[model samples]
Target chain A: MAKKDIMGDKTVRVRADLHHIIKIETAKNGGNVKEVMDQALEEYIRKYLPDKL
Target chain B: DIMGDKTVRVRADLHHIIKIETAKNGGNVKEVMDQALEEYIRKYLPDKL
Candidate 1:
């Protein structure tokens, strides 16, 4: 059930292995991984990210 | 052994900050979350919250 069929425009670099980088994110809130990831990105952005031009 | 943890589900009608704070540092579960879903839940979940 945990697959890449879901991903939002939000991501954070957490770790890497060999030639792969692990991205930590909120599982898509719409009951999907991507949506959850987006939620996490939103939280992080709202809490930390600066204004965007 | 770790799977059969004690858990009690309760309905939280209100969001009391004091209750939340209690759960956070009071070193207990009823301080915040209603459903206490872990015997070890108190210890493991407390630190995370």
Candidate 2:
């Protein structure tokens, strides 16, 4: 794996409708939005993808 | 395939430097920045991050 951002660390743009959903969900639950996203990504990788050796 | 323009959040990496100086007399870390950074590491365990 390269130490460079060759994967581009994608920038996600949210629309107004999605932003409303995110804001409402965040206000309802107070853990962390980014943590949730990170965990989801990890789970997806673990289920179907092998990690870098 | 381009996502929405204004709604995107940009994530960037940042580097923070904390310099530690050895105490001339006590042989302990003397720099205030070092002490504060140490306390932060003890509290946060930056190794986790």
Candidate 3:
């Protein structure tokens, strides 16, 4: 079954190791790249977003 | 495990600078520092390499 798309997408470039982490996490979670990015970025935002803002 | 990489203890200020430059350069701390040294060498001693 196709996964549901919850939001529109945009481009953001991160470092090499981050991309490596996303690749590994994608396999570990049996999910796609975007899904992994969403998971990681959401956690980051939850923790640090307000501090930066 | 040294793995041919010599470990040298540094002061906190230098460590902070390394961390900041690494983040700004978007690479590992070692690679950033290595590149900085490489550039410095090339600039000062063009024939050394």
Candidate 4:
């Protein structure tokens, strides 16, 4: 067989509507798009994902 | 043809950046974005949008 990460950590596909929203929001959030998106996720995990509910 | 849920088109660079970060963070891409979306809404629209 083939070897791979198998966790699907390659590309993130999203809806067009969300893409537009994120694009606009990313720009608004100081243009640091990656930072903005990443921070949002990190904060989200801290708030709701607390190591297995 | 795109299938399963929705699809969004982004810049190649942004895609690369997100892919790298996703790997570093280690999570379900869909769930992570779902959480990120809610977080964004709350952070930006604290009082409700």
- lDDT of candidates 1 onward, in order: 0.27, 0.32, 0.42, 0.51
Strongest candidate by DockQ: 4
- lDDT by residue (A1-53, candidate 4, tens digit) is 13222312234554445455557666666564445455565566556554521
Candidate 4: list runs displaced more than 4 Å. Answer: A1-10, A51-53, B1-28, B45-49
What tens-digit string does per-residue lDDT give for candidate 2 at A4-33? 354233333333333344455557766443
Model 4, range B1-49, lDDT digits (tens) per residue?
4424444332333344445657878755665665565567667745533
Model 2 misplacement above 4 A: A1-20, B1-49
TM-score of 1: 0.25
* Predicted complex 3: DockQ: 0.03
How do the residues B1-49 of candidate 2 rate in per-residue lDDT, one tens digit apiece? 3324223322221101111112333333123222332343344334522
* Model 2 vs. true fold: TM: 0.33
DockQ of candidate 1 relative to the true structure: 0.02
lDDT of 1 by residue, B1-49 (tens): 1222222222221223224445666643332222222222233234422
Better of 3 and 4 by lDDT: 4
Error of model 4, residue B14, in angstroms: 16
Q: By descending TM-score, how would the candidates be arranged?
A: 4, 3, 2, 1
lDDT of 1 at A23: 17
Q: List the DockQ of the predictions in order.
A: 0.02, 0.09, 0.03, 0.18
lDDT for A15 in candidate 3 is: 40
Rank by lDDT, highest first: 4, 3, 2, 1
